[PDB]
């Protein structure tokens, strides 16, 4: 499109990120690869606001980067996640997530929204990047029937819809996540999906800051693969730029040109899986191409680093209240701690096998 939201503009690094990879660095022996694992710190990566504690630290990002970019002549852009809705993923084993639809569920997500864009709304030389709820409105495509998806369903319309109508009054460029080339790239899935993503941009008011769409989102799919990766058998769209290449078209005939930001963060190396629904810290897996408006295709405006790598997927503890028991498939590097925590070992491994190399 004409207006890409990543060009003219300097990504603030998260500190957060940087702090967990500076201290992971110092713990990796041999000491090229060290540097090289230390160098992840100057990767752009996004910010998951996951829950309503995170909401102060967005404050400092958004302060912060105002300043760096009076102090370097640049204008700043801060990468987020928007991913707390009630009865956070529905077809997961487990819950997690602070809030749930029984407990006024949506009306805290209203006010947890609100939280942001009262930070925001202080900020306004700031630009504000935003991937909407990963892992959500995809599960209205394909999975209404599992029984808790049927019943958030109206719920996530109605929290996803608020996010996309106070995050535009504040200026902030939004890309809603929509699965990955395994999950809605399946030709048949393609249309359901168009016609969903259409109706919320609709409930959304077409704003122009809706830009578009967020794919393979702490996932591992090739952009571009060489050949396609036995997990894909059945789909001709193996990769993200099949499953973009055909799903872009049907949102440019609702009226919506749609474009797309494509996680690779984990990207790097492929045929890593025994199931392509398998996506729990998934062992041998490397950084992959790094960041950039250098994307290859007219439909994707970044490629970006969305979930960042070294940051757990999930427990392989089956006593966890949060254990999911894809993180003790035979592909998922075990033993594995508590989600969003460090795991060093899956980071140093990161490293190692980073495609391009670091």
Known sequence: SANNPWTGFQIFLSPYYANEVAA???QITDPTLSSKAASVANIPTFTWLDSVAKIPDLGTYLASASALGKSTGTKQLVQIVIYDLPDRDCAAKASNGEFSI????????????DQIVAQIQQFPDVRVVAVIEP?????????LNVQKCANAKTTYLACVNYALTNLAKVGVYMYMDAGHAGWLGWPANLSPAAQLFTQVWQNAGKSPFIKGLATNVANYNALQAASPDPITQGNPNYDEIHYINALAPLLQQAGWDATFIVDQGRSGVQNIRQQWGDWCNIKGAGFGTRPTTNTGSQFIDSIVWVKPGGECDGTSNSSSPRYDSTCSLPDAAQPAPEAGTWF????????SAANPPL
């Open 24 to 26: 992971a660095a110092k």
């Open 344 to 351: 060093q070992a899956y980071f140093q491994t990161l490293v």
């Open 135 to 143: 892992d959500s409105l995809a599960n209205l495509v394909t999975n």
């Open 102 to 113: 029984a407990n006024n569920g949506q009306a805290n997500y209203e006010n947890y929204i």
